[PDB]
Symmetry: C2
Amino acid sequence: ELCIAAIHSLCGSYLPPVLQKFCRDYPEVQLRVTSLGSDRALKVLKDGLVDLAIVMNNRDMVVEVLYDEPIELLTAANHPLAAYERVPWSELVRYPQVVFKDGYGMQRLVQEKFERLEATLQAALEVNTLDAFRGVVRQGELIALLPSSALVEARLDPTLAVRPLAGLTRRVVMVTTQDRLQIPPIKHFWQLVREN
Amino acid sequence: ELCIAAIHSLCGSYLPPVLQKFCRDYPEVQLRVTSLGSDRALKVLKDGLVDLAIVMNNRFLTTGRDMVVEVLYDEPIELLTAANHPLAAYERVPWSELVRYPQVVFKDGYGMQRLVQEKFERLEATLQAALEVNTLDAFRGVVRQGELIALLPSSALVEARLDPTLAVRPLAGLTRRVVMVTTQDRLQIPPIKHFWQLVRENIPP
């Protein structure tokens, strides 16, 4: 049993290649990949429930930075804001959003941005999965701010539109303990992740 | 003010239209919808953290004192594979072949996990559970890699059917019953009653 906590974006963006390479190299180790908010991801690591966590930065501990990536806008196709090539902040600020629930970094990222802007954040509706995000935004009322790697399926959905912003960025990091890296399959997954 | 728990299939199937009618009818109400495995969805209902839950039937829902229970739909279990998976060749996949391939599965606390483990026990075939996962996005992401196949409820395959990199097939059945559950005290509260009403009159279709 190799147990992993990971940001929702990773199992439909870059992780599956790593999962496959690992299983090839350790055939008898069952993988467990639990998609979680960063904050919960660190709890369950501390509790010994996972061996490794891939989380954001709003939140003997070995950390490695993996990448940065912009935040973009998700929209119903033919939402007014889909008219822009790049969506200006003054327009975006006007429209109600779907948001992540508490314990997700992106949530604390979107709050922080709107605090600095001094524009009121209109949080119609809270969700906890990327599917829910797409399902809601499809319905045409609400828009969502989401990291680029979360929007892979979104870009190919003709019901939806994805747009860069006129920047707002997040960093994704990998996190474990030192004693854990003395375990070769864990170490191997750690190096696999960065290897590719 | 209104907190919903729901199995993953709902927010990519029948629930987003209900959310939309609900926010327009009660605009000052903050809606939270948390996608969860059935066990946790019920824990959080019992504990007052959500106001109602849509869950996979566990066969005991009416044993609770204050319970009201609405059956929404029954549905088949179907197979998910990569487009170019050998099993994609069939129109209706037979169990005798399907049993021979390593699977992605749900982890602990999902009704779908037991449904699948028990079936395999009952078939005297051994489940090869190479990977556990907890969302439909992960199921799709992993299955596009062409090693693993997945047993999923029909309504959990909406986006998979529109993805040319994936194949969805019926089996040659396994079914599940999705139900909505709350306590009778909560249905005295107007927005919970309204949400209850919207679901019963729209989630089935």
